[PDB]
Ligand binder design. Sequence first.
Ligand SMILES: OC[C@H]1O[C@H](O[C@H]2[C@H](O)[C@@H](O)[C@@H](O)O[C@@H]2CO)[C@H](O)[C@@H](O)[C@@H]1O
Ligand code: NAG
Ligand code: NAG
Ligand code: NAG
Lengths: 11, 473
Amino acid sequence: YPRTNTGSGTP
Amino acid sequence: MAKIEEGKLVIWINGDKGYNGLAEVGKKFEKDTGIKVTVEHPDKLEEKFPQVAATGDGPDIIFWAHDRFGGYAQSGLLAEITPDKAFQDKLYPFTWDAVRYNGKLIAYPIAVEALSLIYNKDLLPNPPKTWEEIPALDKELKAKGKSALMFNLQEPYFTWPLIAADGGYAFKYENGKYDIKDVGVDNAGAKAGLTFLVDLIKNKHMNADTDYSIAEAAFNKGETAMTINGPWAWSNIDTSKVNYGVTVLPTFKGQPSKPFVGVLSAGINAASPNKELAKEFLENYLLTDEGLEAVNKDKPLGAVALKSYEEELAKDPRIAATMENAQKGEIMPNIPQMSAFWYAVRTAVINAASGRQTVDEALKDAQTNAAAEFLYVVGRKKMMDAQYKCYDRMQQLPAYQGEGPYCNRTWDGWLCWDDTPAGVLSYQFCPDYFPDFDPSEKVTKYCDEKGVWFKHPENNRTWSNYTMCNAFT
Ligand SMILES: OC[C@H]1O[C@H](O[C@H]2[C@H](O)[C@@H](O)[C@@H](O)O[C@@H]2CO)[C@H](O)[C@@H](O)[C@@H]1O
Ligand SMILES: *[C@@H]1O[C@H](CO)[C@@H](O)[C@H](O)[C@H]1NC(C)=O
Ligand SMILES: *[C@@H]1O[C@H](CO)[C@@H](O)[C@H](O)[C@H]1NC(C)=O
Ligand SMILES: *[C@@H]1O[C@H](CO)[C@@H](O)[C@H](O)[C@H]1NC(C)=O
């Protein structure tokens, strides 16, 4: 389980 | 050196093999032809070869097990070898099969390698038939100043028999071709094998640091009752005068250990200008009774590919064991994907042995890595299929009919959004690209009072809020 990022720099 | 020297042979072979034996054959070659053969044994030659092969420090001939040669072929680093039918009949058909890649021979086989269980007959007259019965044994032996079993944990060649025993595999072999979409590194059985090994370490029966030369020293100095190793090792043991046996590997969950079987082979560098000299060395000097004896005398090859010389060696009980262990196991694939598989499994065992990761964690990374080719296509295609629906529906829906400002329809990289009116907070279900995203949860995208999509305050980039997608776990 690597954690998906949702911050600025994602969509 | 800008180029490889024309008119000599430079040969590369691993440091555990009979390199001085090989140099003897090289000395005979120089006696007959007048051209010097230099034998070398660099560290990690299997990793160095692609980087240096055409460079000018590159060898004319490279010795390694057959599994690395498919990747070498794909990169165009190897000459196609051209033995005639008469020479081919001198070696066993199955060995030629290990060195075939996309229909072509890419190396000359030398010997069939498989790990066996080695034991000290003085300490242990009766070796264990089964892995499960080992900890019991180590408890007795510690009381007497000994360890039951020490072998290389750092390399996954040595730990793979256990992992494969209860159902672990590299790539599924169906239709006579290996399927790289299906990888057996994270299945029930593999987990079980590796767990047993980690438990041996938790219960002090082995030490995670144990590597090739520590384990050799321990066995050969009679500090440990057993070791796991291949025929190359037998020389140094003889020297020590530990009284020893070579036998079948221990069963795990009532199924035998399945080593990956290597065919030690010799390739010719595509950039060598000495290719015919190389062919002449390998065919007329090395692969002979004379030649293989020089090498086997220095450090044993195991079971050779040359039928003539295997008939001298077949009476030896250490060979019979070697073949028995081979038969229980599997011949390695040679596909390019093997380099990735070994990296995966190496990394997993070290992390788990070391305490860095649980077994299930360590292995899920191995599955991701071993099957990187396939998972990039799927992940990539999920997304592309969504892009194209977005584009179709962006072309299809009629113009905004609204007298005010509005933010217009857009593909944000992960989801499609429609023309949206000013000051409206738009929403839809999370995508399922990633394992941590719940598609029952929702994503927001806010259109500002001036008809412009929301920008992140960290960098003014147009941004939809996927925070709810993976926020609860
Ligand atoms: O451990 C991964 C390693 O396994 C095999 O290499 C063996 C080789 O076959 C043997 O000849 C012996 O010397 O030891 C090596 C392991 O230390 C694969 O052939 C190799 O590509 C892979 O990296
Ligand atoms: C929508 O907005 C983009 C970005 O501001 C703009 O380039 C484009 O002309 C607008 N019109 C349509 C129909 O996409
Ligand atoms: C974002 O844009 C506005 C307008 O150009 C500006 O006031 C603000 O400093 C910018 N923020 C960042 C993070 O650069
Ligand atoms: C995204 O939504 C979350 C949860 O509703 C909220 O806490 C957060 O402020 C939003 N992100 C930004 C940067 O507006």
